[PDB]
Amino acid sequence: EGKPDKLVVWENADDGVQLNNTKKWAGEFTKKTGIQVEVVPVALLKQQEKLTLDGPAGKGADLVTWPHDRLGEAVTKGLLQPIQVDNSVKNQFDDVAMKALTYGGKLYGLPKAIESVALIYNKKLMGQVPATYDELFQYAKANNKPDEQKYGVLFEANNFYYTYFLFAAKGAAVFKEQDGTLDPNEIGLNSPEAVQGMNEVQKWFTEARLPQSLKADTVNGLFKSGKVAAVINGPWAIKDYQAAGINVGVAPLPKIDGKDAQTFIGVKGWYLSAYSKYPKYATELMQFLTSKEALASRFKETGEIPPQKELLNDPMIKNNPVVNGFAKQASKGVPMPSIPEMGVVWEPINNAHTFVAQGKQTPEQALNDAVKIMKEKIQTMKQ
């Protein structure tokens, strides 16, 4: 008496390819095992906050997903539990991706996607990509006409995730480096070099005339409308652009100060809620959703590159010029930090970008204020 064996999965609310693909494969798991699986759309960046509330209340999903940067935060808050999988299961995936989903020596997920932003261009507007960043920036300055919705280069310049390469080019770092990624609280986001990076961000709004209070929808919408020659964005945008009829090209970001652009690398995995009533069955589902066959289908539908060893060297991924551009850029990037203190960085740093873009605060004042705030919030991350 009482046998409603039902699992809940939260997938990104893209009202599209990512949601459908998971609905597909969860249904195949139901067909195989008899276990009912409900795939519910919840925005990628809202999932961790939602589980924080709903999880302890018994209303959270069994499987959840978000980029790995906030793993340490999630693990320290007790949102997630380490997963029980065989060595052979782990061996199917790329080591960088597995490392990103590991915290304190414990594995917290199986990867679905590995990603970096690159230069995505309209081939009908841009035949050849600029050789350097200075050339890209001049092209932007010469062609960005916000008085007609036409742009040469447009991207989320008010977002640190996107602007990181500007900071990295100047020698700036999220956390200072000294043998290992584990950084106690040495934030480097208001170093002289970090101000240099934020100086470059300012230039995109002053010289290149980028719109105020930017968001993804503005960037994507204007590109899909054929009004933008090039954007800086990730593999997650490709299907949307192609369905909008854009003949898309993808190239690594043009060299900045003569060096490879150091973009963030992101890993998206399935995680297992610490409040799941069925961790055994949910982990079985997690393995099913990240199998070679499942992830090959996921790439075809969603365009997101699966960090599965064999698939990474599969022709549809390694020998696809569009996918190749992202892969090359990611090879020059750095994984986002995943230590708990990373869960204090994003809001103040993005706020700093906004103050700079809106001409309300200087790069120095914005970043100094931001790091002060970060340090303050970290002093409450303990028992």
Ligand X SMILES: OC[C@H]1O[C@@H]2O[C@H]3[C@H](O)[C@@H](O)[C@@H](O[C@H]4[C@H](O)[C@@H](O)[C@@H](O[C@H]5[C@H](O)[C@@H](O)[C@@H](O[C@H]6[C@H](O)[C@@H](O)[C@@H](O[C@H]7[C@H](O)[C@@H](O)[C@@H](O[C@H]8[C@H](O)[C@@H](O)[C@@H](O[C@H]1[C@H](O)[C@H]2O)O[C@@H]8CO)O[C@@H]7CO)O[C@@H]6CO)O[C@@H]5CO)O[C@@H]4CO)O[C@@H]3CO
Instruction: Give 46 or 277: the residue with its C-beta nearer to ligand X.
Output: 46
In this structure, what DSSP letter does residue 43 have? -
Assess contact for 345 and 264: CB atoms under 8 A.
no
Instruction: Give 13 or 89: the residue with its C-beta nearer to ligand X.
Output: 13
Task: Show the CA angle centred on residue 140, arms to residues 134 and 146, nearest 5°.
Answer: 155
Q: Does 216 sit near ligand X (CB under 6 A)?
A: yes
Element (H, E) at 317: helix 315-318
User: CA distances (Å), 211 to each of 164, 329, 365, 381, in order?
Assistant: 19, 26, 22, 36
Element (H, E) at 369: helix 363-378
* Six-digit token string for 87: 């060595």
Contact with ligand X (CB under 6 A) among 28, 150, 226, 346: 346
Span near ligand X by CB under 6 A; candidates 38-46, 187-195, 203-211, 306-314: 38-46
Q: Does 234 sit near ligand X (CB under 6 A)?
A: yes
Residues followed by a gap in the chain, C→N > 2.5 Å? none
Report d(CA 63, CA 39) in Å as an integer. Answer: 9
Q: Does 257 sit near ligand X (CB under 6 A)?
A: no
Instruction: Give 174 or 281: the residue with its C-beta nearer to ligand X.
Output: 174
Span near ligand X by CB under 6 A; candidates 41-49, 137-145, 287-295, 365-373: 41-49
Amino acid at 87: N
For tokens 């002060």, the residue is 372
Chain length of the chain? 383
Shortest Å distance, C-beta 2 to ligand X = 35
Terminal alpha carbon distance of the chain: 42
User: Where in 84-123 is the site for ligand X (CB under 6 A)?
Assistant: 115
Q: Does 243 sit near ligand X (CB under 6 A)?
A: no
Site string for ligand X, 265-304 (x = CB under 6 A): -x--------------------------------------
* Six-digit token string for 122: 């309209």
Instruction: Give 12 or 191: the residue with its C-beta nearer to ligand X.
Output: 12
Q: Does 53 sit near ligand X (CB under 6 A)?
A: no
Q: Does 159 sit near ligand X (CB under 6 A)?
A: yes
Instruction: Give 40 or 45: the residue with its C-beta nearer to ligand X.
Output: 45
Contact with ligand X (CB under 6 A) among 215, 259, 277, 318: 215
Contact with ligand X (CB under 6 A) among 70, 224, 239, 332: 70
Rg for the chain (alpha carbons), in Å? 21
Report d(CA 74, CA 42) in Å as an integer. Answer: 17
Q: Does 347 sit near ligand X (CB under 6 A)?
A: yes
Instruction: Give 159 or 361: the residue with its C-beta nearer to ligand X.
Output: 159
For ligand X, the binding residues (CB under 6 A) are 12-14, 43-46, 67, 69-70, 115, 159, 161, 215-216, 234, 236, 266, 346-347, 350
